[PDB]
Amino acid sequence: EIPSTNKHLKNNFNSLHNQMRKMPVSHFKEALDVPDYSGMRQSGFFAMSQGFQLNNHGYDVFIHARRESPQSQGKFAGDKFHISVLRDMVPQAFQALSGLLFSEDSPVDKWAVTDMEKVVQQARVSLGAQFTLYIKPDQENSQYSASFLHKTRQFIECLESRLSENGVISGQCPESDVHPENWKYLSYRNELRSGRDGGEMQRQALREEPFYRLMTE
Amino acid sequence: GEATVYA
């Protein structure tokens, strides 16, 4: 149909899944020279760490992180993840994940974390979904490569294990997202085909997203 | 102000 990133996943659904399941473990050299959560909130107008431009300048309640996109990279296709932890443990969770989030090997060029001092405690992005990781197709024609999907899945699974290994308590996953039982913190939604309001109907549609299935099955 | 959107 019109071709698009998702059309490609649908038509190469099994090829991608099979290629991914044959690849060797991904390795991410974690960064050490990174800010802690307090440092992140001090980003203000502008800060830099491992190539990620940081800012906590205002408008919204988040601290943003963005590394320059490769010329070979495609256009955002809606795929993204949230990370939900106990509200009280966001600073510790951030620190635990910093080495991966700022990694020169990370597949995620853009992400954001809630500034807990800018939101009310009972807020949707306060009780959970305190991190948002944006994914985009890695190939010039806006298609996902098997290599990149495997790397992304490996990365999200590393985030999961790091938080669990740190014994971080889980948060309240947003109604908008879906996640399998083995993801205790991560959740997913595609912003091109879903909104922020929950509903089993939207979760149902999301569960059928080829990208989500490739990330979980 | 609390929107997790990409833009």
Residue A86 forms part of a structural domain? yes
d(CA A106, CA A80): 14
Return the percent helix, strand and coil in chain A, to nearest 5.
Answer: 35, 15, 50
Residue A105 forms part of a structural domain? yes
Residue A182 forms part of a structural domain? yes
Domain extent, residue A72, equals 1-20+43-217
Residue A36 forms part of a structural domain? no
Which of A56, A79, A122, A134 is the mutation pick for testing B, counting most B CBs within 10 A? A134
d(CA A179, CA A33): 32
Residue A38 forms part of a structural domain? no
Residue A72 forms part of a structural domain? yes
What CATH number does the domain containing A117 carry?
3.30.2430.10
Residue A28 forms part of a structural domain? no
User: Chain A residue closest to B6 (CA)?
Assistant: A134
- What sign does the dihedral A6-A11-A17-A20 (CA atoms) show? negative
Instruction: Report the number of distinct structural domains present in chain A.
Output: 1
Cβ–Cβ gap A80/B3 under 8 Å: no
Q: Which residues of B touch A191 (CB under 8 A)?
A: 5-6
Residue A185 forms part of a structural domain? yes
Q: Who contacts A164 (Cβ-Cβ below 8 Å, separation ≥6)?
A: A184, A185
To one decimal, the resolution in angstroms is 1.8
Q: Are A190 and A209 in contact (CB under 8 A)?
A: yes
Q: Which residues of A touch B1 (CB under 8 A)?
A: 59-61
Specify the experimental method: X-ray
Q: With CA atoms as reference, report the closest residue to A9 among A183, A152, A144.
A: A144
Cβ–Cβ gap A110/B5 under 8 Å: no
